[PDB]
């Protein structure tokens, strides 16, 4: 029935203030389309550190995509993707923050470059992960394949690399044509 969804977006330095913006708007179009439903989101920004931009109970309470992501600030740092996925799995999906135990845990990752650290995401084994590689650093194949590890198998379904950030509007419209 209900699914708890988390937005783990990249706020690295290779993001331009305009590219970052498209990432916040994509998450805003995702919540508008999926509001008026069982779904209930949270958002966490990662680079060197890990900050939860708004948790599950904040959503249920506010509900307006826009008003929730207003005090968001670009970190301009590294892209410690592993530490992010773990932070989300043991610090964000919690019932003190307002996660529903009966919901199926989903995570959408949005990065524009290869991870900056090491380790493993075995803690988020039971968290369906969708990773999305954006552009210009995910061009060769050696890089695109590095995102396979963060996502769920088959990676064929869970990993999505885009040519440009302007292609995020496109991915939106591909989820408006799905089941």
């Amino acid at each position: 029935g209900n699914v708890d969804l988390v937005f783990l977006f990249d706020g690295s330095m290779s993001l331009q203030p305009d590219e970052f913006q498209k990432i916040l708007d994509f998450m805003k179009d995702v919540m508008k389309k999926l509001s008026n439903t069982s779904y209930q989101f949270a958002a966490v920004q990662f680079s060197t550190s890990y900050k939860t931009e708004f948790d599950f109970s904040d959503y249920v309470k506010r509900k307006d995509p826009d008003a929730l992501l207003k005090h968001v600030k670009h970190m301009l740092l590294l892209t410690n993707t592993f530490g992010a996925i773990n932070y989300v799995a043991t610090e964000v999906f919690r019932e003190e923050l307002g996660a529903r135990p009966d919901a199926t845990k989903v995570l959408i990752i949005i990065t524009d470059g290869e991870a900056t650290d090491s380790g493993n995401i075995d803690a988020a084994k039971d968290i369906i992960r969708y990773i999305i590689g954006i552009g210009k650093h995910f061009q060769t194949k050696e890089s695109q394949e590095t995102l396979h590890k963060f996502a769920s198998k088959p990676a064929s379904e869970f990993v999505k690399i885009l040519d440009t950030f302007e292609k995020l509007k496109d991915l939106f419209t591909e989820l408006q044509k799905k089941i």
Partner: antibody
Amino acid sequence: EVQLVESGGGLVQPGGSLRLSCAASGYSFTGHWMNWVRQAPGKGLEWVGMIHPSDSETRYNQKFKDRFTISVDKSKNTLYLQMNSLRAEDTAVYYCARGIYFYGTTYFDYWGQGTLVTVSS
Amino acid sequence: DIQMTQSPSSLSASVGDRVTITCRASKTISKYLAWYQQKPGKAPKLLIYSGSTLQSGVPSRFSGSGSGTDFTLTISSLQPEDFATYYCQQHNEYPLTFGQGTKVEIKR
């Protein structure tokens, strides 16, 4: 094309009021902070305050919190600025500018052409 | 509180010359300082934000740099179009404060 058109200025009697307007076009209004920055004839710039379309969270420069009230109309994508008990010094050009809240505090990247408010009897 | 002082309050430079305006802050403000170009009768145009970064659209000839309390706008290879009053504002704390500007005029 991001566009910030302005209106509402003119001549106003001291101890009077006036509500400016900032009609924005070209981007998703409820996604950016909006500011009001005025400019006294031939002087420096002064920041008045900012509001967020989505819910109207506001932050003012204290100098202007007593008389200046800011609000909005999401329906029309129009930004307003309510000014009360204006005085001779409040004469200036009032611009409205969209702003980036990402780094530090806020820096403005898209300004409006400006509106001349003259306070005299 | 935060007084931004700019220097000089005006200057004339031959087309092509390397101009440098300095804006010093009251109390440090990290690398957060932005620079605007106000053509007569028009609205300020953002140029530089966060100390040295160029806005997309600003010709390369404009350069920023500095940190803490002393920053400087460097117009390398002035032009005839670069005529206007150059403003400086800090964005590290409220209320947002601006400078007093510097009218940069083209000597011919």
